[PDB]
Structure 1
Amino acid sequence: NSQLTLRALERGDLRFIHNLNNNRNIMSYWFEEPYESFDELEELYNKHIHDNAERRFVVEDAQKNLIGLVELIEINYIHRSAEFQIIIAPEHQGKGFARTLINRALDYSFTILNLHKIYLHVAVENPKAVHLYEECGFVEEGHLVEEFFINGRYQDVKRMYILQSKYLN
């Protein structure tokens, strides 16, 4: 709903993020191996406290339930571009929060970091997310062929993208 907010990740939030980072199936559409020790994650978090090339956001409702995660990575201040990554948690999915949350990472990228472009990557075989993004104003700019090994085979992905004005206006 409108109650949904975003907030900078925090050390208190690191069990909730670990639990999602070890879920084979949540992690399956992020193209990332489900194996992170709470030691490795914790330490990767600390090493990156001051890395200005990312914003990692924890997603919350009103009753203070952690809904999921929005991430901006690969922020380049020269070309003004960033990669966006969203995970809604197992217990918070199929509830209709996607549109909202995706739209606050643009709101953020665009109304705060003054970015020129946000781009994502999405499995053609997760053809629910691609309609979600479309319906937010993202257009397809590449059919990456056999990019990422997911689940026993090489799987294709769509690079999608929305520009700053487009969102802002």
Structure 2
Amino acid sequence: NSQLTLRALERGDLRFIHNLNNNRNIMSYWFEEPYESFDELEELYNKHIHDNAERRFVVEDAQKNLIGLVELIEINYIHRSAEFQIIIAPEHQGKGFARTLINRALDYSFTILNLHKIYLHVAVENPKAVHLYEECGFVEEGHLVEEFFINGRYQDVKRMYILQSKYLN
């Protein structure tokens, strides 16, 4: 589990991005523009390559297998906040990486990027995930009502946060 690195995303990784944001039955976005096809995604990559409102990090193991993806979006450089999201590739889900990847993401965000606050959205219908992020130090600050249409109905999500000052004690 200590074998896991975050690498900044490069053009070559878009194939992985696409494979991941695939069998997920939700709309996938790149800098808030939606895409389904690889070619749509590439054209978006080229259009937003200099924009730093979102920052993505590919996660690899010791033999550089692609394990998953860390995204930060809605980055705001005045308030120093960002929305966190994680995708583990289906083949590596359930092996114990989620916790490790999360703490690596927090470490990157809070030391290297010097962000003040990280948040995320977790479906309320997934109380397992909620409890996971809880165990990793996140706390509820919001119960967003019918925020997202997911799987043919409107759903609530927990808004959960952690501050730099708490993670660094």
CA contact 1:21–1:35 (8 Å) conserved in 2 = no
Distance in 2 (alpha carbons) for counterparts of 1:31 and 1:140: 26
The runs of 5 or more residues in structure 2 that have no matched partner are: none
Distance in 2 (alpha carbons) for counterparts of 1:119 and 1:164: 11
The runs of 5 or more residues in structure 1 that have no matched partner are: none
Distance in 1 (alpha carbons) for counterparts of 2:4 and 2:10: 18
Once the two structures are superposed, residues 39-76 of structure 1 have per-residue CA deviations (whole angstroms, 9 ceiling, x without a partner) of 11112222221112121011100111100100011111
1:29: Cα distance to partner?
13
Number of residue pairs aligned between Structure 1 and Structure 2? 169
Once the two structures are superposed, residues 69-128 of structure 1 have per-residue CA deviations (whole angstroms, 9 ceiling, x without a partner) of 000111111111100000001000000101110111110110011111000011011222
CA contact 1:139–1:161 (8 Å) conserved in 2 = yes
1:6: Cα distance to partner?
0.5
The farther-off stretch of 43-52 and 61-70 is: 43-52
| SS of equivalent residue, structure 1 residue 106 | helix
Runs of 4+ in structure 1 off by over 4 angstroms are 25-35
Give 1:37's aligned residue.
37
CA contact 2:31–2:48 (8 Å) conserved in 1 = no
1:10: Cα distance to partner?
1.4
1:159: Cα distance to partner?
0.4
1:24: Cα distance to partner?
2.7
User: What is the RMSD of the two structures over their aligned residues, measured on CA atoms?
Assistant: 2.6
CA contact 1:143–1:158 (8 Å) conserved in 2 = yes
| Superposition TM-score, scaled by structure 1 size | 0.92
